[PDB]
């Protein structure tokens, strides 16, 4: 099987600066006509992976001239001239010469912007759950960049340990901002049992981490 | 012009699965069919294809599954076929439909012994911008939808990647920020779909 090796597989680039990425084959796929059979490809979030260049430097349909494909035998690159918003995604070279169709690892590109903090929101569990005989707190971390941010639970201010979950949102096409969402799960009797449910958040766009708090049934 | 993919979804290990591509505006037969596979948070890997009806329809398959998978076209129907047997869950992965000489959309296939499970759908109420949102509880397997006011509230959304919870089961939060000065006059509901287990439900938020 031909190998593709892609450099780098991550990089984070301010919006009208450029990005470059290399794609290295094991084989040549230089073609008798000139071109390579070598492409390019954008996944999205959500998205299945959209082609970008074909032929090596051929761009698809629709594919402005910001983006360019370079390159000849082994050794190829990706060019961004200038990078949008829109551009967050994983971006992979794939080798079209002959089967197995192979692909490089996959490039994250992260769109850099400014220092955003999030907008902290907390939700006690729903009547409807407790009726149901379970308890979810939810905890949003609204719009934030950098991804990284520290959520901590605190139930009459028990530090809460190993009964949360999180996930993070991939990088917003327009803002350039990643969301989280923090679920502390705990029975309806020990939910009954308490009352100061509060979500601490830490994140550098935020001189002091932010909590925000409820006391079940409203006291 | 359009591909349909179907055949996906819940498979036991050492099962058997037929995913199909359904070709719209154009005629299958003069194009080339491939099949990619990417489990979640994964690359991307070549299942197989299938030659154009000129190039006599030859099947080249990946050695990873290697004698247990059967590529095919049916003419009559304008559809190709990518039928995969002794399924293991190392199988598990979004299985892309590509059109060569477009990428479909894609069918998850899950292997695993767990049984299909429709979620509970809890609304995450509110209280200048609010937050408010739907807890979409116990499900398997993936995938779930959720969209709001029927399509027509796109801004402000961000429907989270499920989580596996340690009972096995899937559990995601879909939230939106709205002006809070909308919140006594614009109705929020949430469209909750999980195919799997058929289970549709438009769940109204209110603030209290």
């Known amino acids: 099987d031909i190998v593709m090796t892609q450099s780098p597989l991550s990089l984070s680039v301010t919006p009208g600066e450029p990005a470059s990425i290399s794609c290295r084959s094991s084989?040549?796929?230089?073609?008798?006509?000139?071109?390579?059979?070598l492409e390019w490809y954008l996944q999205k979030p959500g998205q299945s992976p959209q082609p970008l260049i074909y032929?090596?430097?051929t761009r698809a349909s629709g594919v402005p001239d910001r983006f360019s494909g370079s390159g000849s035998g082994t050794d190829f690159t990706l060019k961004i001239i200038r990078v949008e918003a829109e551009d967050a995604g994983t971006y992979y070279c794939?080798?079209?010469?002959?089967?197995?169709?192979?692909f490089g690892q996959g490039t994250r590109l992260e769109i850099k912007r400014t220092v955003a903090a999030p907008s902290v929101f907390i939700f006690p569990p729903s009547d409807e759950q407790l009726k149901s005989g379970t308890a979810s707190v939810v905890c949003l971390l609204n719009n934030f960049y950098p991804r990284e941010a520290k959520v901590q639970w605190k139930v009459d201010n028990a530090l809460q340990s190993g009964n949360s979950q999180e996930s993070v949102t991939e990088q917003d096409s327009k803002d350039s901002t990643y969301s989280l969402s923090s679920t502390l799960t705990l029975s309806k009797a020990d939910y009954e049992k308490h009352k100061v449910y509060a979500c601490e958040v830490t994140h550098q766009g935020l001189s002091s981490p932010v909590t925000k708090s409820f006391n079940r049934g409203e006291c | 012009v359009q591909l349909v993919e179907s055949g996906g979804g819940l498979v036991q290990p050492g099962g058997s699965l037929k995913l199909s591509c359904a070709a719209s505006?154009?005629?299958?037969?003069?194009?080339?069919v491939h099949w990619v596979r990417q489990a979640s948070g994964k690359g991307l890997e070549w299942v197989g294809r299938?030659?154009?009806?000129?190039?006599?329809?030859?099947?080249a398959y990946a050695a990873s599954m290697r004698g247990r998978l059967t590529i095919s076209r049916d003419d009559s129907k304008n559809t190709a076929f990518l039928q995969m047997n002794s399924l293991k869950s190392d199988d598990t992965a979004m299985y892309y439909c590509?059109?060569?000489?477009?990428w479909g959309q894609g069918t998850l296939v899950t292997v695993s012994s767990a049984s299909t499970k429709g979620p509970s759908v809890f609304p995450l109420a509110p209280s200048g911008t609010a937050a408010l949102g739907c807890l979409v509880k116990d499900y398997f397997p993936e995938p779930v939808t959720v969209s709001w006011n029927s399509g027509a509230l796109t801004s402000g959304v961000h429907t989270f990647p499920a989580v596996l919870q340690s009972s096995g089961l899937y559990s995601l939060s879909s939230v939106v920020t709205v002006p809070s000065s909308s919140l006594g006059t614009q109705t929020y509901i949430c469209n909750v779909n999980h195919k799997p287990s058929n289970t549709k439900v438009d769940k109204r938020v209110e603030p209290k």
């Open positions: 590509v059109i060569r000489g477009q």
């Open positions: 505006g154009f005629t299958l037969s003069g194009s080339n």
């Open positions: 299938i030659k154009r009806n000129a190039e006599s329809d030859a099947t």
């Open positions: 084989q040549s796929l230089l073609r008798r006509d000139g071109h390579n059979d």
């Open positions: 032929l090596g430097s």
């Open positions: 794939m080798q079209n010469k002959q089967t197995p169709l192979t």
